[PDB]
């Protein structure tokens, strides 16, 4: 009802606090704009009040948890899942290439400027330890998206 299986809720849960500064249990525009900007879009002031307008949950410039994703959930309905995953990589990959690093986890959140500790990431870093090196390119980055 509120919390599902770890990886099932893993995205919208964590992406629940992404926007929610106030968190009346909804998502506001001032948040949705602070979000988008980190993906490489035109930083507009109305973009957030506009983005919640068409995907209006409450229409007071607030979007709920089942609506914000309705577009990625749409990619679940539509078979456009093949051409998006490579551009969805570009989201973080501003280098147009992408290299193997488990440290990437810390660059995505700091791309927004999130604050984490050395031990927080020592676990989030070890939560991705591969072969014994600890780096991960587009292989695990896309698989992160392709896997449910």
């Amino acid at each position: 009802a509120d919390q599902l299986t770890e990886e099932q809720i893993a995205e919208f849960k964590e992406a629940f606090s992404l926007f929610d500064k106030d968190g009346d249990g909804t998502i506001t525009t001032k948040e949705l704009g602070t979000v988008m900007r980190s993906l490489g879009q035109n930083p507009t002031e109305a973009e957030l009040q506009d983005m919640i307008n068409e995907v209006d949950a409450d229409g007071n410039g607030t979007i709920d948890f089942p609506e914000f994703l309705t577009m990625m959930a749409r990619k679940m309905k539509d078979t456009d899942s093949e051409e998006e995953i490579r551009e969805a990589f570009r989201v973080f990959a501003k280098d147009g290439n992408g290299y193997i690093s488990a440290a990437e986890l810390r660059h995505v959140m700091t791309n927004l400027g999130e604050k984490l500790t050395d031990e927080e990431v020592d676990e989030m870093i070890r939560e991705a330890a591969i072969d014994g090196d600890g780096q991960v390119n587009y292989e695990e980055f896309v698989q992160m998206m392709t896997a449910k």
Partner: peptide, 29 residues
Amino acid sequence: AGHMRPKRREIPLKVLVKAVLFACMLMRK
């Protein structure tokens, strides 16, 4: 052919990027 069999000990992230592959659909041109 070659078996490896993965093991489960720690939980995955699937958000610190998924919450970025999710918003990459709002205005994908």
